[PDB]
Amino acid sequence: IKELAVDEELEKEDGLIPRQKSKLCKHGDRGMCEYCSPLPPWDKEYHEKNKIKHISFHSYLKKLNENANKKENGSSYISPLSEPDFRINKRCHNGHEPWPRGICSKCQPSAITLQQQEFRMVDHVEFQKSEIINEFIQAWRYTGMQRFGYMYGSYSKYDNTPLGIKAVVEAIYEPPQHDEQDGLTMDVEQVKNEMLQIDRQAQEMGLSRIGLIFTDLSDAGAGDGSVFCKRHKDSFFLSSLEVIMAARHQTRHPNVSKYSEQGFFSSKFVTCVISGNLEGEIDISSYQVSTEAEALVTADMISGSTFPSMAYINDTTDERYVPEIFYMKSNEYGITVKENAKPAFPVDYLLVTLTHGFPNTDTETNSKFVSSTGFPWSNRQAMGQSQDYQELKKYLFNVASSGDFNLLHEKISNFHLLLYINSLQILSPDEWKLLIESAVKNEWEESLLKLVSSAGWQTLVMILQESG
Amino acid sequence: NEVGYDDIGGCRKQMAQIREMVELPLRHPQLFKAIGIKPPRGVLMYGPPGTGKTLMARAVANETGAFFFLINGPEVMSKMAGESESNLRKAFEEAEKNAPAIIFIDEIDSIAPKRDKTNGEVERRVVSQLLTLMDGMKARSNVVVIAATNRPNSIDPALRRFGRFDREVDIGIPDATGRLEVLRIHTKNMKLADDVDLEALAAETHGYVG
Amino acid sequence: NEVGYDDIGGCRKQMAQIREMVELPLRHPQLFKAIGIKPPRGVLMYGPPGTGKTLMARAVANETGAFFFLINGPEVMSKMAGESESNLRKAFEEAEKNAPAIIFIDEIDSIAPKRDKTNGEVERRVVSQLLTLMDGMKARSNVVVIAATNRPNSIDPALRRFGRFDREVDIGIPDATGRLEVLRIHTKNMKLADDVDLEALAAETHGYVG
Ligand SMILES: Nc1ncnc2c1ncn2[C@@H]1O[C@H](COP(=O)(O)OP(=O)(O)OP(=O)(O)O)[C@@H](O)[C@H]1O
Numbered sequence A: 001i002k003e004l005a006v007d008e009e010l011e012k013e014d015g016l017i018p019r020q021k022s023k024l025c026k027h028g029d030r031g032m033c034e035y036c037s038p039l040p041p042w043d044k045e046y047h048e049k050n051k052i053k054h055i056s057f058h059s060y061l062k063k064l065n066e067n068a069n070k071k072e073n074g075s076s077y078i079s080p081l082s083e084p085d086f087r088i089n090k091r092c093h094n095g096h097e098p099w100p101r102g103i104c105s106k107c108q109p110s111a112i113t114l115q116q117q118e119f120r121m122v123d124h125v126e127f128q129k130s131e132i133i134n135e136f137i138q139a140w141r142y143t144g145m146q147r148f149g150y151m152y153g154s155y156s157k158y159d160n161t162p163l164g165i166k167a168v169v170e171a172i173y174e175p176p177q178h179d180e181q182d183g184l185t186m187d188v189e190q191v192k193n194e195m196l197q198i199d200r201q202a203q204e205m206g207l208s209r210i211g212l213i214f215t216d217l218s219d220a221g222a223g224d225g226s227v228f229c230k231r232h233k234d235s236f237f238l239s240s241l242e243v244i245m246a247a248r249h250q251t252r253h254p255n256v257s258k259y260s261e262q263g264f265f266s267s268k269f270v271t272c273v274i275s276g277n278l279e280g281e282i283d284i285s286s287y288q289v290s291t292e293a294e295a296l297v298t299a300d301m302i303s304g305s306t307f308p309s310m311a312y313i314n315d316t317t318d319e320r321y322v323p324e325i326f327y328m329k330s331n332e333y334g335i336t337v338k339e340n341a342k343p344a345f346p347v348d349y350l351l352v353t354l355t356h357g358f359p360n361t362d363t364e365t366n367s368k369f370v371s372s373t374g375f376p377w378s379n380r381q382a383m384g385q386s387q388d389y390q391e392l393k394k395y396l397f398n399v400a401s402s403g404d405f406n407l408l409h410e411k412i413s414n415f416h417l418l419l420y421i422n423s424l425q426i427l428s429p430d431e432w433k434l435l436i437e438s439a440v441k442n443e444w445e446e447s448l449l450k451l452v453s454s455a456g457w458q459t460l461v462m463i464l465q466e467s468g
Numbered sequence B, C: 001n002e003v004g005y006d007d008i009g010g011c012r013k014q015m016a017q018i019r020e021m022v023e024l025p026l027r028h029p030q031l032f033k034a035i036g037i038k039p040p041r042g043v044l045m046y047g048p049p050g051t052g053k054t055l056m057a058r059a060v061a062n063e064t065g066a067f068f069f070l071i072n073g074p075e076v077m078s079k080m081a082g083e084s085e086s087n088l089r090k091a092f093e094e095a096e097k098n099a100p101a102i103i104f105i106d107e108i109d110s111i112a113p114k115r116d117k118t119n120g121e122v123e124r125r126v127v128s129q130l131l132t133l134m135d136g137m138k139a140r141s142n143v144v145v146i147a148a149t150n151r152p153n154s155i156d157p158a159l160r161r162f163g164r165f166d167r168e169v170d171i172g173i174p175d176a177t178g179r180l181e182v183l184r185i186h187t188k189n190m191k192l193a194d195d196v197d198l199e200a201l202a203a204e205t206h207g208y209v210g
């Protein structure tokens, strides 16, 4: 099987950390005893020294390869990187062949200790431009209600975190949803039918749906104060209703891995939320879900509770056997061992954090999508920017009826403009594929003149001039 | 189901010694003001196993009408050191506002064994928490704690001091008239025959406990 | 409040042996120690408990103006393995930048006992780092480690090698001429006294440590 091009590059590099000679070393200069030996990239002591709170899963893959492959014979190639299962094997390899009549300890799911995950799949989410997500908050500034979107992007290496993958996003697509002041809830059938055609155009453009965003602002008084502070240390970090939508999105998009026995493991999916800081701004934060316990129990046992920090655990009806969930908390006198014989266990423990950021404006490798970021989006029907062909006379117009190719190609690289053109499918699919590849790639000057000489682009500007 | 005076037998002379020892601080505290000396707080029952010492503690609690609470032996040791001390503190707080009350604990040998033979860490953990809570409480709430074991010198000897556990009560085996009363309670639902004699089975089993 | 120059009676006839291993690396390294002899850095003070070493090490730091340190045996070694190593490593690099410096170590027997029946390996970890850090300080580091203990035979024989620990000085119990200065120090703070000399009282207190 074949993995991603980014995932195979992190596997080949060892990522060792070099050290220097010290006063504690008693050996010679041409050697190393223990104090200047090469440090492994999975040691968590070096991680918390530089305030890195997770061990960068590609290095966690290396720390399990040392346990799988040894100096001894072995002759196995097991590679035990699989999803730990809480479901019940029906055959059970014993005399209690039905679960209605019989269950023993080798098939019973053990009591969940609630230990936090030490490794994250995505180590650092990054963005492309501050003007891209400024249009997303501007949707709230016009209708006053919450929004929703899906992030399309790619992946590359990250040199800050040892053996880490960074998440790059390029554009944000919004599905048609019904907004509300308190929260939001849309139909999953019309979104999945709409997201199927966007994945078609994302393949030729080199994009993949790897993220989503949802807003939560609660403006205070619209004067000096920006927003309220809903999510803090004493309150919930992520609501339990949005854990369900984050869990189903990770199971729909698996990550291919040759080390896993099933063929897919350790999904690379980000969930970002606009919530605001403690003091005064609308700074965002992102956390992703845990694979070890939460990713498998969401198929059978997650039920909604009235508290945003916790989630209710329901009962067993003849196939849905669940084990007891335990966690430690302080009582009125001291700190005690596991107490939970009670439902509504918290879900903030099962989240691992990420580091969001925006790159510097002075230099970058590329940006690939900065045309205007002011074009009316596809499914923004709550706002007034959902126009017909009247907008195409205002937006591009083949500027001033005779456009220069340095000023014409800079507008054609928009994500939602190219996704609006092919829906009319005036051009051929072969000429459309070279149209979107010219706008997204470099050395575009020889191929842009091929587009203007084609009869399909001439019919597009002729059918636009007669219409309003 | 609740138990009373008729549901036990054999130790009727022994029960009357425990009767006047626990019903005087509960019902009539005016004798404490008249004589000016502290009535006892902790009694200790012991003897051979299977003599119904747990049944006698439920009989003296329901008939007096006090707030009864039970603390079993191995249920404290089934937890760890953290939550077992918190459960012991919660039992003594609810009995203070519900005065008069009886805090009956059971199986003190599992909690307090002989410490000097196995000088350990947990052998002085839960008993030192109990000793600062038993000797430390003072609110004149006239509550009585009852202990139960199978051997009087198997427990740690520091518990048998003044103010904590002073009155020792032995629970002996019933006599011929005593063991007759035990089977009459159990055979209330057993449809026996007419040829079964009542006094014949008492002389048959010489040293049988209830 | 600090110690004076001598301030301890009954040691001035042997205080030069501890002193002469200090100024001779620093006051004359050109004509006295440039022949090709490395300076010995490891001394070993011992004796009965109460002869006052802990101080004697304070007196040589005041008489020479050198930097002083304080490391107790069962205090630093009672921490973690990485915690005791970090306090050991940060003390020697601090002593390098303020030469001359004196690193006082007490109670060597608790860190390095004999290996005839003392099973287990938790003591040999920290004593291997002490012999490691005593090597790479050859050139100009004016440091003299002072090891304080009670019995010289209880220390491990591996510590007594070339360069690690060479001097074994033993301050002894003073006589009537020695303990008279000890009585002279602790009576000059008194307001008045009798008309009887202190040597008449110190004559019968022969086996009495200072
Ligand atoms: N009046 C009575 N005297 C003696 N035994 C009785 C009496 N009434 C009933 N019994 C019988 O004796 C048993 C009582 O024993 P019990 O349950 O107290 O065990 P125990 O070992 O004394 O309790 P613990 O485990 O607290 O020591 C009952 O099973 C009951 O059938």
Ligand SMILES: Nc1ncnc2c1ncn2[C@@H]1O[C@H](COP(=O)(O)OP(=O)(O)OP(=O)(O)O)[C@@H](O)[C@H]1O
Pocket: C007, C008, C009, C010, C011, C049, C050, C051, C052, C053, C054, C055, C056, C106, C148, C182, C209, C210
């Ligand atoms: N010249 C002297 N000889 C003996 N004792 C003295 C002298 N001068 C002062 N003393 C007294 O003896 C004490 C010195 O004891 P010290 O502090 O050395 O205890 P120690 O047990 O020897 O130290 P350690 O804990 O390192 O073994 C001081 O408190 C001091 O009052």
Ligand SMILES: [Zn+2]
Pocket: A025, A026, A027, A031, A032, A033, A034, A035, A036, A037
């Ligand atoms: Zn080394």
Ligand SMILES: [Zn+2]
Pocket: A091, A092, A093, A094, A103, A104, A105, A106, A107, A108
């Ligand atoms: Zn089974």
